[PDB]
Ligand binder design. Structure first.
Ligand SMILES: *[C@@H]1O[C@H](CO)[C@@H](O[C@@H]2O[C@H](CO)[C@@H](O[C@@H]3O[C@H](CO)[C@@H](O)[C@H](O)[C@@H]3O)[C@H](O)[C@H]2NC(C)=O)[C@H](O)[C@H]1NC(C)=O
Ligand SMILES: *[C@@H]1O[C@H](CO)[C@@H](O[C@@H]2O[C@H](CO)[C@@H](O[C@@H]3O[C@H](CO)[C@@H](O)[C@H](O)[C@@H]3O)[C@H](O)[C@H]2NC(C)=O)[C@H](O)[C@H]1NC(C)=O
Ligand SMILES: *[C@@H]1O[C@H](CO)[C@@H](O[C@@H]2O[C@H](CO)[C@@H](O[C@@H]3O[C@H](CO)[C@@H](O)[C@H](O)[C@@H]3O)[C@H](O)[C@H]2NC(C)=O)[C@H](O)[C@H]1NC(C)=O
Ligand SMILES: *[C@@H]1O[C@H](CO)[C@@H](O[C@@H]2O[C@H](CO)[C@@H](O[C@@H]3O[C@H](CO)[C@@H](O)[C@H](O)[C@@H]3O)[C@H](O)[C@H]2NC(C)=O)[C@H](O)[C@H]1NC(C)=O
Ligand SMILES: [Ca+2]
Ligand SMILES: [Ca+2]
Ligand SMILES: [Ca+2]
Ligand SMILES: [Ca+2]
Lengths: 219, 219, 219, 219
């Protein structure tokens, strides 16, 4: 009837990967998401996908709040939706990564949230909660814990510059990053420093990954 | 109680053409629509009507998003409502056309949607999904499949010009159109090229139709 | 539980005049109104009251859309709320009037609505539907039937001037009015022409009434 | 299921202080609040907390309407939420205060509301209803009864100046205050006049308190 996320969709008997309606506690109008019904038993709600560089990710605050791209392709679900999902239960984060040489890796985080205790999550800059790493990609997100989301037109980072402008992305930048999954789709090894789709613990600071998917499931 | 569209209204025992409240999955406040309870068994939700040139259709983005005119007359329901309806099930499209010489024709499309997988349908320009033509008017819409909606103040077409400005309408313009049902009410044969209420496969590019109705029903 | 108007409040067993929560079909968040539980059996939802000139009624479009003043005093409920109420059933209108010499009169209208078939009632200027006069005040509203709402900053009237600016009010002005109940609180006989709280059929065009209340009930 | 406030949360069997979802009558999307389940039996909804000066309270109208800070720390819930809560039942107010010398005091008000009868509470400046003082801190709020909320960018006070600008806060200022709990975190005795976290009846006009919490419970 009114699944709150992709795990409710799965447990209701929908086993196919694809687009489903979900209805978070404080977003009763609901919205559509892509559900991953396969990874570690399934029930993952996707909020980010890179796969081909068809979508511009070098977007401003309003786009990162409201979301962009298409659920069946490259997209960002929007921080207002990611907030609505991660405040309604205790979520884990799964990050799937792929390079241009057939290689894959993943990072699992036991706890993940955006603006968890923010009275106005947008005003407060949708700050990251993330803890408890495991997997094959190595940890490139724990150092971003407690940071606000920074875009090219809204600087909340710990740099004298705008990290989002400098590294051509949008992220919970500190000074500046170990991960940049909303970075430019530069397609593998690049001369420019850390401004591609980067997961530094796996492929370093000068390798733009082929594929990324960020997704959440209640624990 | 809470019909999601005009087919739910019909199946609940309301047989009369007219204005009814509907409540789409992701638009729970609901809104009023005109229901066609006669065409091919009935249960059609109208989203566009031309009949007399009493309403200005040469409107900008905000008007095409939010809707304009009156449900009992010439109107555009608004792309935010057309999105809310066509994302909640698989809809077919019916187009009824009438010329100034008593003549009528129709086009049926087995699949129709607006912004079906768009995270932000407005940002993404409410792109058209349409397939599977049958009827008497001929096909003037399949070539618009995959195109974003373009208005005089928001150009997303495949022309070096603004198709909406050039052809005095608002449509899923490519370069530029085979149909222009939101074009100027020029009343039959006109010297100006393709800037009237055009359905090119029936009446060509220099004939502004007397009547158009665009309406949807779940399959 | 969820009364749609003051008649539902009354029929649920609440007999006292006062402020109650109501929940119109297409305004599910609901809002508070003043309920008149006495007039002709009771169940009237108030949307306008003048009684002492304590509130400024010479307000612009946004104020007339959103409402102003206090439910326990002088107020305007707001055209977005009056639209939400009058589109959900067939309403009658009751107008209670009082002069500064103890005198009272009323006008009853068998049908009343605002933006009844408007796709975007705000865009369409919340046009008046009113018919079927009876009472003691005489008819000062039927000539306003079919007119859009005009304010000092949004002219939709049939005058070469702005009727709202000229007659220091906000109304369904034609060219210009037989009633001006949102006019200046000028307190009885005044030299200035038709710019007070006027009901021309009762007290003419140069008498600003002491009290007005406009209220609706389903028939 | 859908508790309307922290008293519903408590009565449903949740006994722990912390963050909970509540769903006021006219705010059906709901929001998260901090619940005090200990004070005088518990069931208090917090809307203001000062404790360490980590959050800037010298904010404009939009911030005071929408809220700021974090539920687990210093915050302001937002006047739109405080209005949604206090209009749905008859609430009492509890104010807990603490100085920098281990000392504590409280004020209880038998009746408390914001914009209780306002058609547009924001337009009307979220005016204060407060009565019926008891406790140890003395009364520093009854003189603010009937006053609109004033910020540095929106003056509705009875001063020829902007009280909010002058006393570096945001409050139901008259000319100007006996309390200033949204004032600057100046940390105890200060030379500047009345521009700290002031409760004049307890610690006078030149002592910025260490801790304040403002919270409500239905009577
Ligand atoms: C390396 O990456 C691929 C995915 O890109 C992993 O799975 C293999 O994918 C390929 C091509 O996507 C499949 O082979 C081809 O299948 C298609 C039909 O789907 C067929 O038309 C071609 O003729 C070709 O046979 C393949 O089925 C699939 N699995 C295997 C075992 O090759 C692959 O597992 C990744 N890792 C490694 C170590 O290869
Ligand atoms: C041609 O168009 C008309 C609709 O415009 C189709 O139906 C016919 O419509 C006319 C006028 O709208 C009707 O005739 C008139 O009826 C009115 C009362 O409704 C009466 O006052 C007049 O004296 C006149 O008789 C007519 O009933 C209606 N049907 C027919 C059979 O004429 C018509 O079917 C369309 N197609 C063709 C091939 O005529
Ligand atoms: C004329 O207007 C009044 C309302 O303004 C109508 O009712 C009468 O109202 C007056 C004063 O509002 C009442 O008289 C007074 O009552 C108060 C207590 O409420 C008392 O303190 C005073 O000493 C005084 O007696 C009165 O009860 C009320 N009814 C009558 C019969 O006078 C009145 O009906 C209107 N019409 C006419 C033709 O008088
Ligand atoms: C004065 O203020 C304190 C709260 O700040 C009131 O309670 C007392 O708080 C202190 C420190 O917060 C507690 O003492 C310490 O406890 C911690 C562990 O929580 C321990 O690590 C330290 O070694 C130390 O013992 C204390 O338990 C607590 N209660 C008492 C009876 O001291 C206090 O009631 C306030 N009023 C007065 C008159 O002292
Ligand atoms: Ca910076
Ligand atoms: Ca173009
Ligand atoms: Ca005019
Ligand atoms: Ca002032």
């Amino acid at each position: 009837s009114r699944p709150r996320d992709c795990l409710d969709v799965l447990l209701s008997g929908q086993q196919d990967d694809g687009v489903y309606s979900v209805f978070p506690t404080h977003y009763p109008a609901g919205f559509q998401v892509y559900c991953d019904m396969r990874t570690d038993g399934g029930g993952w709600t996707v909020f980010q996908r890179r796969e081909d560089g068809s979508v511009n990710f070098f977007r401003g605050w309003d786009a990162y709040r409201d979301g962009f791209g298409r659920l069946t392709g490259e997209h960002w679900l929007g921080l207002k939706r990611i907030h609505a999902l991660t405040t309604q239960a205790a979520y884990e984060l799964h990050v799937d990564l792929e390079d241009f040489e057939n290689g894959t890796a993943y990072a699992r985080y036991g706890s993940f949230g955006v603006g968890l205790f923010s009275v106005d999550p947008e005003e407060d800059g949708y700050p990251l909660t993330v803890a408890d790493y495991s997997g094959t990609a190595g940890d490139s997100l724990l150092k971003h814990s407690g940071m606000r989301f920074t875009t090219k037109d809204r600087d909340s980072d710990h740099s004298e510059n705008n990290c989002a402008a400098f590294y051509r992305g949008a992220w919970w930048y500190r000074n500046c990053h170990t991960s940049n999954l909303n970075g430019q789709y530069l397609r593998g090894a690049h001369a420019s420093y850390a401004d591609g789709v980067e997961w530094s613990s796996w492929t370093g600071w000068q390798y733009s990954l082929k594929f990324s998917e960020m997704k959440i499931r209640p624990v």
